[PDB]
Design a protein around this ligand. Sequence first.
Ligand SMILES: Nc1ncnc2c1ncn2[C@@H]1O[C@H](COP(=O)(O)OP(=O)(O)OP(=O)(O)OP(=O)(O)OP(=O)(O)OC[C@H]2O[C@@H](n3cnc4c(N)ncnc43)[C@H](O)[C@@H]2O)[C@@H](O)[C@H]1O
Length: 186
Amino acid sequence: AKIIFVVGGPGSGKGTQCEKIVAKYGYTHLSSGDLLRAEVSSGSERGKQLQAIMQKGELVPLDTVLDMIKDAMIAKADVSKGYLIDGYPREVKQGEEFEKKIGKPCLLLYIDAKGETMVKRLMKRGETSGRADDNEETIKKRLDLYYKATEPVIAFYEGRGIVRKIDSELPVDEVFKQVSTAIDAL
Ligand SMILES: Nc1ncnc2c1ncn2[C@@H]1O[C@H](COP(=O)(O)OP(=O)(O)OP(=O)(O)OP(=O)(O)OP(=O)(O)OC[C@H]2O[C@@H](n3cnc4c(N)ncnc43)[C@H](O)[C@@H]2O)[C@@H](O)[C@H]1O
């Protein structure tokens, strides 16, 4: 099965575009954030540790996140012709371990938004839906961690030759036209 990585800053639009891909193309959307949140909601001790980390806007350890992604991919293996890995990898080492333990991606959709745009989007969502990490201080930390840890992922996969940059400043449907062009070109 094809493995597509979807990487971009917090609030850039990764989840939105992934849900569009699912509806049009039928790939399996796995979200690292949603997996981690599902553990938090289980009430486990592990979930309590993850909630603490996520609330602070820091990165969860690679071992826990990659486990859960692998767990989810195995659970869907029967029925998936492709996977969208949304929000993983977030550092170069995550990408390398994923390739060692699972397989190589065929495409990286780089969901590119401006920093100010991301702040605005996450503040709006936080005011609405109240996700715990959508508060101003945590937003700032998430964005700074993205620039520091995650942009080198984009460089790594530029070196591999598989990055397609998606202008996520446009309206949702215009972003998805770019996304669709990239996927149709595989
Ligand atoms: N691999 C990893 N390693 C270690 N730790 C990890 C990890 N993965 C996760 N974690 C941990 O878990 C935390 C959460 O990670 P995760 O949940 O993956 O959150 P994120 O990167 O913080 O993503 P969001 O879901 O905040 O953004 P999105 O880019 O999907 O934007 P969306 O489409 O929702 O859109 C945002 C909003 O904007 C709107 N919007 C989208 N596109 C547009 C558009 N084109 N125009 C106008 N509005 C738009 C949406 O409607 C919505 O309101 C991390 O901070 C970390 O602690």
